[PDB]
């Protein structure tokens, strides 16, 4: 009853899975330590800007009254200083204090940290990535370290670069930058490597395919210009290296003000007790069938009821269930997990201990929002409140007519299991009073907002 | 024990519902009479070119071994002479003579008639619509009868226009043409009227919203060009008039070489015996929950399991159920009824006598195909064979590579409940083995053919 939640925030995407992969990797590694007894947290949850579990939903999902939120982002700017605290409801803008933003929201102590890329331990993670990218014999002393920035003035990266120069285990360290579409152009890298070899580490959480193409073109330009250039070993993005989890832990601690921890959140616990009572009877939630299976719980798609075990792909972890359900049957990403697009073909066998994380990853926010609606205490947010928060390209949703929003919502939300309470639709029973398809929507989602944007820009 | 089936064939659509409502209106009227005892057919079924029940499916749905197929088309031309016979598998092209084309296919004797538009009874239906359209005091001999054709070469309508002149009930009779996108265009109609009034009857099964705006547009042009034009009364499409049912009956009767009749098709009868068995125990079929309800049956969406009965819209006829499931929750047409897009919010209560029609209109061909697959005898048609039947802009599907079709099918078919047997996908268990989402796909559908056409076109 000194209990604490860690939340990790990633960018996410409507379309590309890689963009959640760094957050999901680190989350699972830290839970792993929790299983082993070396985690100063009692749970590790995820939230995303551009998919579910969303920024607006993530504090509804935390089990405990003491929460630490760490941004798994490598730059300090718009997204981290404006977008994430605004969507989180932290009422803060601009530079984050070292040590973080401390708030009281819900019945909850929340502390929002500086981003991952700001922590000095990122210099260690870079160096480790670089050494792991080399071939079995090679003295780093003979290797020049190239650090690939995503944008021009990443002040943190320059700092890490100078730390690694001083520590002196590389022949040299250069910051490289791809051109358009002062740091050294990647297309020129051999002009800076007079002897030995080079190694490239992207200072990136991940590498999407357009980005990867920009990069290999840059390198092909280099090689055309310098046809006998040093051997170059190209690493993966530092955001996927195992060391980032240790950096996340250091960031999470620095700035902590109170050492007491928190307590369990009662509303949340009540929701999950109801969920357990249902799982024990057997029951259905969305497109998922839950079946007690001795001392375990099986989950499968309701369409796959009665289907032979060996005609299914079985998993036995919450994470493997998440992964199997991340894309639809065409292989396309599912950013809104309540969409009526859950793929067939899978089975999950879960321990009683793992059931909650399993459902929370499969259907984020649904157990808690449903239970709250069942008991008429789900408060929802009108379109106007949502539209008025948006900045960037999304601010334009503010000039959508109520006809435009209804028309777009009719089309978008038809794909979804939820009922759009924020648009005046009503929901009388939920998953907790017998109805598998009875799920509340409390607020216009990121896929709806983008569609309204597009409609508004069509003129 | 002389048993016979009538099959009505319409155009249908991927996107719009009018193009089937004419066929559905006639079919439903004729089933009503068959209960009043006043029908020479023991069932009335539907099939469509561009939606389910499709031309490839409809004959497998017929209960009897003697079948009459009437095209509800107001033309007699390439579509009725070449396309419908080719898709139905009749082994016929060109002119169909009065009395039909007779074939033995499967176990059935099938007679394919001339189209609705070719029967001389259509003059009576046109006159009746004309009379109904006049201010009900009006005297016909004071009125010029204008007949709107879709396209220029409607020789059948010209035949009728001449019969109606000879009857003489009207001041005169002229054909005019829908606007492009030597009978005179509708925008010139007063050039063909010498009486002091006119009545326009569209020789169409239906009038979509596009074509309706264009008709209004043409009428505005006529009114400017001819400020002296007399008053025009505008009737709806003749295809929607109750008098068309009597013409269909007359067409069905012409040429029945005999008055013997047929027997029950045993394969079809077996599949419905299997379904009845499943129904008395309660079962799930795709996205539908089938429950014994005393001596009737209840159907609802599986997502609505447990939902309060009074929160649902109740229907009690197969046709009502069909109408309520015709569109998705965005109001978009569902041409392929096995798509995972069945709307929520309804319940059907059906007598045992209505169960089969109910299920056949809700999910065309699913019962029979599923039954046949479990008995290891569902015959599938390979892609290249489908592609090769096609003509026009659609023949372009013939250019798609195996990878191109595999790529489009993964994207399109992801929306579908069915498993593409024709593409080498296998299905080990169907609805009849207790798997709600186990449904076979025996042949590429019109929605997938159009998607492959667009892909080839884009590349
Ligand atoms: S806004 Fe619409 S699509 Fe998004 S979660 Fe809500 S109901 Fe679903
Ligand atoms: S071709 Fe694909 S979308 Fe069409 S009915 Fe078959 S499985 Fe369904």
b/e for B338-377, b at 16 or more Cβ within 10 A? bbbbbbbebbbbbeeebbbbbbbbbbbbbbbbbbbbbeee
The single-letter DSSP state of residue B456 is H
Mutate to test the pocket of ligand 1, among A334, A339, A418 (most ligand atoms within 8 A of CB): A418
CA nearest B157: which of B80, B259, B73? B73
User: Would the CB of A366 count as within 6 Å of ligand 1?
Assistant: no
Indicate yes or no: CB of B429 within 8 angstroms of CB of A311: yes
Q: Which of residues 398-417 of A touch B (CB under 8 A)?
A: 410-411, 413-414, 417
- Burial class of residue B230, CB neighbours in 10 A (0-12, 13-18, 19+): middle
Dihedral sign from CA coordinates of B77, B83, B85, B91: positive
Only one residue has tokens 């839950």, namely A290
Backbone φ and ψ for B359, nearest 5 degrees, come out as -75, -35
Indicate yes or no: CB of A344 within 8 angstroms of CB of B302: no
Q: 3-class SS at B419?
A: strand
- Alpha carbons within 13 angstroms on the beta-carbon side of residue A171 total 17
Domains along chain A? Answer: 1-120+244-265 (3.40.50.1400), 121-243 (3.40.50.1400), 266-377 (3.30.1360.190), 380-457 (3.30.70.2320)
> What count of other Cβ atoms lies within 10 Å of the Cβ of residue A278?
17
Resolution (A): 1.9
- Alpha carbons within 13 angstroms on the beta-carbon side of residue B11 total 20
Dist. CA B442–CA B451, nearest whole Å: 18
Q: Which ligand is nearest to the CA of A53?
A: 1
Q: Which chain A residues have a beta carbon less than 8 Å from that of B307?
A: 429, 434-435, 438
Cβ neighbours of residue B238 closer than 8 Å, sequence gap 6 or more: B74, B122, B125, B126, B129, B201, B202, B203, B204, B244
Dist. CA A267–CA A256, nearest whole Å: 26
Dist. CA A145–CA A172, nearest whole Å: 6
CA nearest A235: which of A200, A188, A205, A207? A200
Dist. CA B233–CA B135, nearest whole Å: 8
CA nearest B17: which of B207, B156, B199? B207
Return the bridge partners of B296, or none: B293
Structure-token pair, residue A212: 């990867």
The single-letter DSSP state of residue B79 is I
> What count of other Cβ atoms lies within 10 Å of the Cβ of residue B403?
8
b/e for A346-383, b at 16 or more Cβ within 10 A? bbbbbeeebbbbbbbbbbbbbbbbbbbbbeeebebeeb
Dist. CA A358–CA A316, nearest whole Å: 10
Pick from B301, B312, B339, B340 the residue to mutate for testing the A interface (most A CBs within 10 Å). Answer: B340
**Determined by which method?**
X-ray
- Burial class of residue A168, CB neighbours in 10 A (0-12, 13-18, 19+): exposed
Dist. CA B177–CA A165, nearest whole Å: 83
Residue whose CA lies nearest to ligand 2 atom number 6: B441
| Residue A268 CA, distance from chain mean position | 22
Only one residue has tokens 């009108």, namely A382
DSSP, residue by residue, B354-384:
HHHHHHHHHSTTHHHHHHHHHTT------HH
Backbone φ and ψ for A112, nearest 5 degrees, come out as -100, 120
CA nearest A286: which of A60, A438, A95, A146? A438
Radius of gyration over every alpha carbon of chain A, rounded to an integer in angstroms: 24
Strands laid side by side in the B232-234 sheet: B184-185, B172-177, B143-149, B197-202, B232-234
Residue of B nearest to A427 (CA): B311
Can you count the helices (H) and strands (E) in chain B?
A: 14, 17
The single-letter DSSP state of residue B335 is S
């Amino acid at each position: 009853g000194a209990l604490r939640s860690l939340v990790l925030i990633g960018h996410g995407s409507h379309h590309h899975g890689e963009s959640a992969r760094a957050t999901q990797q680190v989350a699972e590694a830290l839970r792993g330590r929790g299983l082993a007894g070396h985690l100063p947290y009692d749970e590790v949850l995820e939230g995303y800007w551009q998919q579910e579990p969303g920024l607006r939903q993530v504090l509804r999902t935390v089990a405990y009254s003491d929460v630490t939120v760490v941004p798994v982002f490598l730059s300090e700017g718009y997204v981290t200083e404006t977008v994430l605290p605004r969507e989180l409801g932290l009422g803060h803008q601009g530079p984050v204090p070292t040590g973080g933003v401390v708030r009281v929201l819900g019945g909850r102590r929340v502390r929002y940290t500086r981003p991952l890329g700001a922590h000095p331990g990122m210099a260690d993670a870079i160096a480790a990535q670089a050494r792991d990218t080399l071939p079995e014999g090679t003295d780093p002393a003979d290797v020049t370290l190239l650090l690939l920035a995503a944008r021009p003035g990443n002040a943190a990266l320059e700092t890490h670069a100078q730390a690694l120069r001083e520590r002196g285990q590389f022949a040299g360290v250069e910051v490289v930058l791809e051109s358009r579409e002062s740091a050294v152009p990647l297309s020129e890298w051999p002009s800076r490597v007079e002897a030995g070899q080079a190694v490239l580490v992207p200072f990136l959480t991940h590498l999407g395919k357009h980005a990867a193409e920009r990069l290999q073109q840059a390198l092909a330009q280099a090689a055309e210009r310098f046809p006998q250039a040093p051997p170059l070993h190209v690493g993966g993005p530092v955001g996927e290296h195992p060391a980032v989890a240790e950096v996340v832990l250091a960031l999470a601690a620095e700035g902590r003000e109170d050492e007491r921890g928190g307590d369990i959140d009662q509303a949340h616990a009540e929701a999950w007790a109801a969920l357990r009572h249902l799982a024990e009877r057997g029951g259905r939630l969305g497109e998922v069938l839950l079946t007690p299976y001795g001392g375990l719980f099986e989950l499968r798609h309701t369409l796959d009821e009665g289907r032979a075990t060996l005609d299914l792909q079985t998993v036995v972890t919450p994470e493997g269930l998440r992964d199997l359900t991340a894309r639809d049957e065409a292989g396309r990403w599912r950013p809104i997990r309540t969409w009526r697009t859950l793929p067939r073909g899978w089975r999950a066998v879960l321990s009683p201990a793992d059931l909650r994380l399993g459902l929370e990853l499969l259907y984020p926010a649904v157990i808690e929002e449903s239970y709250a609606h069942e008991h008429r205490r789900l408060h929802w947010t009108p379109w106007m409140s949502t539209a008025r928060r948006q900045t960037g390209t999304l601010a334009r949703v503010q000039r959508a007519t109520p006809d435009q929003v209804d028309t777009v919502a009719a089309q978008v939300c038809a794909s979804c299991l939820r009922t759009r309470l924020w648009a005046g639709h009503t929901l009388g029973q939920t998953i907790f009073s017998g109805v598998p398809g009875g799920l509340p929507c409390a607020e216009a989602c990121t896929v709806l907002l983008a569609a309204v944007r597009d409609e508004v820009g069509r003129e």
